[PDB]
Amino acid sequence: EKERQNRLAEERARREEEENRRKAEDEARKK
Structure with a gap:
């Protein structure tokens, strides 16, 4: 469970x- 949750969290x-x-x-393009 923790493996799955950590994988999803890093995703x-x-x-x-x-x-x-x-x-x-985007902001750089605005610049």
């Missing part, structure tokens, strides 16, 4: 950092 965090760098490069 979530990776998607989150994807969106963060994405908004970052």
Whole structure:
């Protein structure tokens, strides 16, 4: 269970950092 939950949690965090760098490069284009 913990293996599964941690895997899903890192998948979530990776998607989150994807969106963060994405908004970052968007703002960069606005610059």
